[PDB]
Scaffold this active site. Sequence first.
Site, PDB file in Angstrom:
ATOM      1  N   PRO B  21       6.967  -3.208 -43.278  1.00 12.49           N
ATOM      2  CA  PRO B  21       5.517  -3.420 -43.355  1.00 12.49           C
ATOM      3  C   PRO B  21       4.844  -2.072 -43.572  1.00 12.49           C
ATOM      4  O   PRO B  21       5.121  -1.126 -42.844  1.00 12.49           O
ATOM      5  CB  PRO B  21       5.182  -4.019 -41.989  1.00 12.49           C
ATOM      6  CG  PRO B  21       6.247  -3.457 -41.088  1.00 12.49           C
ATOM      7  CD  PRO B  21       7.490  -3.548 -41.942  1.00 12.49           C
ATOM      8  N   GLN B  96       2.568  -9.437 -41.255  1.00 13.51           N
ATOM      9  CA  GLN B  96       2.497  -8.717 -39.985  1.00 13.51           C
ATOM     10  C   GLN B  96       1.080  -8.747 -39.397  1.00 13.51           C
ATOM     11  O   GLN B  96       0.123  -8.336 -40.052  1.00 13.51           O
ATOM     12  CB  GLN B  96       2.914  -7.252 -40.170  1.00 13.51           C
ATOM     13  CG  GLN B  96       3.020  -6.546 -38.838  1.00 13.51           C
ATOM     14  CD  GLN B  96       3.196  -5.053 -38.955  1.00 13.51           C
ATOM     15  OE1 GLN B  96       2.320  -4.352 -39.468  1.00 13.51           O
ATOM     16  NE2 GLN B  96       4.332  -4.558 -38.472  1.00 13.51           N
ATOM     17  N   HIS B 175       3.043  -6.949 -34.674  1.00 14.34           N
ATOM     18  CA  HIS B 175       3.160  -5.484 -34.648  1.00 14.34           C
ATOM     19  C   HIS B 175       2.925  -5.048 -33.197  1.00 14.34           C
ATOM     20  O   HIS B 175       1.784  -4.918 -32.762  1.00 14.34           O
ATOM     21  CB  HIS B 175       2.117  -4.856 -35.572  1.00 14.34           C
ATOM     22  CG  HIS B 175       2.287  -3.380 -35.754  1.00 14.34           C
ATOM     23  ND1 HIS B 175       2.944  -2.588 -34.837  1.00 14.34           N
ATOM     24  CD2 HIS B 175       1.889  -2.559 -36.754  1.00 14.34           C
ATOM     25  CE1 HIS B 175       2.943  -1.337 -35.270  1.00 14.34           C
ATOM     26  NE2 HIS B 175       2.310  -1.294 -36.430  1.00 14.34           N
ATOM     27  N   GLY B 176       4.008  -4.846 -32.451  1.00 14.57           N
ATOM     28  CA  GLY B 176       3.908  -4.452 -31.054  1.00 14.57           C
ATOM     29  C   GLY B 176       4.436  -3.043 -30.853  1.00 14.57           C
ATOM     30  O   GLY B 176       4.935  -2.693 -29.780  1.00 14.57           O
ATOM     31  N   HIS B 178       4.367   1.445 -32.341  1.00 15.26           N
ATOM     32  CA  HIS B 178       3.633   2.632 -32.763  1.00 15.26           C
ATOM     33  C   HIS B 178       2.317   2.992 -32.074  1.00 15.26           C
ATOM     34  O   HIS B 178       1.401   3.515 -32.710  1.00 15.26           O
ATOM     35  CB  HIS B 178       3.415   2.563 -34.275  1.00 15.26           C
ATOM     36  CG  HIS B 178       4.662   2.245 -35.044  1.00 15.26           C
ATOM     37  ND1 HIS B 178       4.649   1.944 -36.388  1.00 15.26           N
ATOM     38  CD2 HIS B 178       5.958   2.190 -34.657  1.00 15.26           C
ATOM     39  CE1 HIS B 178       5.885   1.718 -36.799  1.00 15.26           C
ATOM     40  NE2 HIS B 178       6.697   1.859 -35.767  1.00 15.26           N
ATOM     41  N   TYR B 180      -0.050   1.094 -30.940  1.00  9.79           N
ATOM     42  CA  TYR B 180      -1.225   0.263 -31.220  1.00  9.79           C
ATOM     43  C   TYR B 180      -1.502  -0.670 -30.021  1.00  9.79           C
ATOM     44  O   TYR B 180      -0.912  -0.485 -28.976  1.00  9.79           O
ATOM     45  CB  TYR B 180      -1.062  -0.438 -32.573  1.00  9.79           C
ATOM     46  CG  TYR B 180      -1.176   0.574 -33.705  1.00  9.79           C
ATOM     47  CD1 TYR B 180      -2.357   1.287 -33.911  1.00  9.79           C
ATOM     48  CD2 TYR B 180      -0.085   0.881 -34.521  1.00  9.79           C
ATOM     49  CE1 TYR B 180      -2.449   2.282 -34.899  1.00  9.79           C
ATOM     50  CE2 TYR B 180      -0.174   1.884 -35.517  1.00  9.79           C
ATOM     51  CZ  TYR B 180      -1.359   2.574 -35.692  1.00  9.79           C
ATOM     52  OH  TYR B 180      -1.489   3.578 -36.636  1.00  9.79           O
ATOM     53  N   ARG B 333       9.083   4.380 -47.003  1.00  9.63           N
ATOM     54  CA  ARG B 333       8.756   5.331 -48.059  1.00  9.63           C
ATOM     55  C   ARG B 333       9.490   5.156 -49.389  1.00  9.63           C
ATOM     56  O   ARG B 333       8.869   5.192 -50.456  1.00  9.63           O
ATOM     57  CB  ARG B 333       8.917   6.759 -47.515  1.00  9.63           C
ATOM     58  CG  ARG B 333       7.798   7.119 -46.531  1.00  9.63           C
ATOM     59  CD  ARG B 333       8.072   8.406 -45.785  1.00  9.63           C
ATOM     60  NE  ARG B 333       9.091   8.242 -44.751  1.00  9.63           N
ATOM     61  CZ  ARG B 333       9.556   9.240 -44.004  1.00  9.63           C
ATOM     62  NH1 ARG B 333       9.093  10.472 -44.182  1.00  9.63           N
ATOM     63  NH2 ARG B 333      10.465   9.010 -43.060  1.00  9.63           N
TER      64      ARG B 333
HETATM   65  C1  LIG Z   1       2.418   4.703 -45.686  1.00  9.49           C
HETATM   66  C2  LIG Z   1       3.008   3.924 -44.510  1.00  9.49           C
HETATM   67  C3  LIG Z   1       2.387   2.831 -43.945  1.00  9.49           C
HETATM   68  C4  LIG Z   1       2.955   2.075 -42.834  1.00  9.49           C
HETATM   69  N1  LIG Z   1       2.298   0.963 -42.341  1.00  9.49           N
HETATM   70  C5  LIG Z   1       2.867   0.268 -41.357  1.00  9.49           C
HETATM   71  C6  LIG Z   1       2.231  -0.948 -40.831  1.00  9.49           C
HETATM   72  O1  LIG Z   1       1.157  -1.394 -41.255  1.00  9.49           O
HETATM   73  N2  LIG Z   1       2.910  -1.580 -39.849  1.00  9.49           N
HETATM   74  C7  LIG Z   1       4.158  -1.166 -39.299  1.00  9.49           C
HETATM   75  O2  LIG Z   1       4.637  -1.836 -38.436  1.00  9.49           O
HETATM   76  N3  LIG Z   1       4.749  -0.034 -39.790  1.00  9.49           N
HETATM   77  C8  LIG Z   1       4.167   0.650 -40.756  1.00  9.49           C
HETATM   78  N4  LIG Z   1       4.786   1.785 -41.273  1.00  9.49           N
HETATM   79  C9  LIG Z   1       6.101   2.166 -40.725  1.00  9.49           C
HETATM   80  C10 LIG Z   1       7.110   1.500 -41.678  1.00  9.49           C
HETATM   81  O3  LIG Z   1       7.155   0.081 -41.549  1.00  9.49           O
HETATM   82  C11 LIG Z   1       8.577   1.864 -41.585  1.00  9.49           C
HETATM   83  O4  LIG Z   1       9.011   1.688 -40.204  1.00  9.49           O
HETATM   84  C12 LIG Z   1       8.851   3.278 -42.025  1.00  9.49           C
HETATM   85  O5  LIG Z   1       8.224   3.501 -43.337  1.00  9.49           O
HETATM   86  C13 LIG Z   1      10.352   3.423 -42.133  1.00  9.49           C
HETATM   87  O6  LIG Z   1      10.803   4.769 -42.370  1.00  9.49           O
HETATM   88  P1  LIG Z   1      11.097   5.187 -43.868  1.00  9.49           P
HETATM   89  O7  LIG Z   1       9.777   5.408 -44.570  1.00  9.49           O
HETATM   90  O8  LIG Z   1      11.865   6.545 -43.684  1.00  9.49           O
HETATM   91  O9  LIG Z   1      11.950   4.150 -44.530  1.00  9.49           O
HETATM   92  C14 LIG Z   1       4.233   2.534 -42.329  1.00  9.49           C
HETATM   93  C15 LIG Z   1       4.847   3.664 -42.915  1.00  9.49           C
HETATM   94  C16 LIG Z   1       4.309   4.370 -43.967  1.00  9.49           C
HETATM   95  C17 LIG Z   1       5.050   5.548 -44.530  1.00  9.49           C
END
Ligand SMILES: Cc1cc2nc3c(=O)[nH]c(=O)nc-3n(C[C@H](O)[C@H](O)[C@H](O)COP(=O)(O)O)c2cc1C
EC number: 1.3.1.42
Lengths: 376, 374
Positions: B21, B96, B175-176, B178, B180, B333
């Site tokens: 997500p 999500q 989404h539980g 980071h 939040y 990413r």
């Molecule tokens: C630009 C960006 C936006 C993200 N937005 C969310 C989000 O809305 N909800 C969430 O649960 N995680 C979010 N994440 C965390 C990602 O779901 C994921 O855990 C993370 O990108 C994984 O690491 P990786 O980028 O090295 O693959 C976000 C990450 C990035 C880089």
Amino acid sequence: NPLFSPYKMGKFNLSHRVVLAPMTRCRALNNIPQAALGEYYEQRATAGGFLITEGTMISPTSAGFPHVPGIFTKEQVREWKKIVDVVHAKGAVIFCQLWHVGRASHEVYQPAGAAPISSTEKPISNRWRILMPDGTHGIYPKPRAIGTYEISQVVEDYRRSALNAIEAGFDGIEIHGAHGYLIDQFLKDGINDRTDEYGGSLANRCKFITQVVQAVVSAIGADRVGVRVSPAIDHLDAMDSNPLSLGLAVVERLNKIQLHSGSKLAYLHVTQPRYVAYGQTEAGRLGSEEEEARLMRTLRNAYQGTFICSGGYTRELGIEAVAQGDADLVSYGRLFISNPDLVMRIKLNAPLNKYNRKTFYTQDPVVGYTDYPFLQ
Amino acid sequence: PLFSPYKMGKFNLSHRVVLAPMTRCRALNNIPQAALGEYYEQRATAGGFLITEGTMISPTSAGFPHVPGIFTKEQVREWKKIVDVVHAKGAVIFCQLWHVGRASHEVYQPAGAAPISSTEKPISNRWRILMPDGTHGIYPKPRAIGTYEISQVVEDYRRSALNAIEAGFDGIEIHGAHGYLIDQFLKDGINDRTDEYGGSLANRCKFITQVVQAVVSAIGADRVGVRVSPAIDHLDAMDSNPLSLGLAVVERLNKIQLHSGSKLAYLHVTQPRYVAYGQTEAGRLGSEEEEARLMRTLRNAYQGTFICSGGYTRELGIEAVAQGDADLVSYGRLFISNPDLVMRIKLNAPLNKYNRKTFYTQDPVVGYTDYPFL
Ligand SMILES: Cc1cc2nc3c(=O)[nH]c(=O)nc-3n(C[C@H](O)[C@H](O)[C@H](O)COP(=O)(O)O)c2cc1C
Ligand SMILES: Cc1cc2nc3c(=O)[nH]c(=O)nc-3n(C[C@H](O)[C@H](O)[C@H](O)COP(=O)(O)O)c2cc1C
Ligand SMILES: [Cl-]
């Protein structure tokens, strides 16, 4: 490039502001400086550049890592001499960092397997580990709280070790008063639970570092003494309820020692917390380093003398620090481990070799120590 | 291993590469846009699992600009169009549900009300929020909500989950993590409440339990995934015993499954990737070993599908699935810059680099749908 404007640190006319930060590497087998150390410091030495050695033992109870060098015996002094000579032959200035770990030790590192000494009987928590001689991680044990007389003996160990460093030819010494080690165990109110004259008030908590600095200053001169602290780093459960207040209290004590001695210390070296920006989170890249910068700037503004900043500096951050007047010198640790010619690479804005944490504390005289390549 | 088929409930996945997500801020005025459809369609693959960007469950639940919501029928209408394009390519998609709690700003508060949370404590100065004009703002003082308000927020999750099903989603992810809203209640480094929702681990886990139960009772356990991050450095979200907290959550999720008589869709856990104190002598000693144990302990404790996320690469993902550490691996990413990351991973092809500068911008194309297929 501001990192390359000369800087006058006392009598020393440094040609640039890139400093080798003190880094424990564990190649001084059975606490005796080895030829490998000579090669390592020589690789990094530059004409007019300043180097600070790895933390060095001031007595038999001062270690909490394996194969760290000492400078409390004449045998150690003779071996350090060879390293100091090769570094001076390259035109560099070098100080020896005096290090006592206090409670951050283990019976395996203590004579007769005795308990490590400290300001308190409280042990570092299991949130932290110690590197054992066999390469595994160990648990920090309960230390023994030392009394006033023994405190004066440890101060004498610093004095004797400073004299020995001068005997070996070092340009000066640096008091390791940071990162939760012995001196920080007296400074931090999260550790110091004493009820005597060395505990409680800021004045009382600063008594030990003041006594240590005064003793070395009276033995070799303030000009040959640098002091390192880290009020805002809580490594090894070393937190203070008011980091800035504590830092300013230490700075005022240093300012006072200088006025009374009629001479300035070589410098104040402060390590700052550095929060790595995680790219995998939603707001990791939206953070601010503002507050930690203001704390550092305030300590520098308060201190009457040369200020060396350290902690996660890069080429760009180092340039900014000197350009904005936030620091006079910038010390680098990890990038200097993997880039023997770090100064040249920063001057040319060349790529920097990555470092391998796996060999930071291993014992090989070459592997992960002197085999990182120079610019081709 | 990443292409060894996996059975997730009634979903036969063809591979283990999941779209994590990711908030991208292209949903202008909180309304899903046609752009999102192309974006997700681009990454959709037959038998592939995708999780949408965090989506608002109420008008006060956002902390980023132009993030989609799913609390109004209009939003539902637009999401359906996106869901359809994804299903067309034979992919499974979960929406999500996201409430930021204290991680908000007055600009994202319709009634100028203080952001809600478990505590009165504001996120520290070292963290900032993204503003509508692209600048970074300061996090305000949140309001420690009363015991009675918790039920209405749970209700917002429930209504939103129903709306997500009305929209056609195969399920929703809570989404539980980071730091939040839900995580603000779980972490003892944030939750300083002295009531039924604070204090003991049990009390701290009450909120996420109530949220999960409400949505499970609304749409079925099989259509609910849950994301947590017991150990993460984000928005001052820390806890004394990450392992204890993680296992407490897992134990309550396992119980919800037993009482419901059906397993959840999955448990999604962020990898800590802890790197604090690298500039100290002993800070890093035993860190990698502890997080690895933390994850395996949770994976072995959770009764169901386990998805790992955070810093994974083609090699690390392969290893996670080969060693039995995870059933599915979500990528963030790399999926931003590589629309066909699945195909690329399958062929061990070159991966496109991503441009962070355009992660949260509003262009429906630039840095969103313009990354090349190869
Ligand atoms: C630009 C960006 C936006 C993200 N937005 C969310 C989000 O809305 N909800 C969430 O649960 N995680 C979010 N994440 C965390 C990602 O779901 C994921 O855990 C993370 O990108 C994984 O690491 P990786 O980028 O090295 O693959 C976000 C990450 C990035 C880089
Ligand atoms: C392997 C290693 C060993 C260290 N040993 C010491 C030491 O003996 N004395 C000390 O004061 N600091 C020590 N430090 C802290 C460094 O002097 C320096 O503050 C830190 O490396 C600077 O951050 P940087 O690595 O990002 O440049 C050590 C750091 C590392 C990585
Ligand atoms: Cl001098």
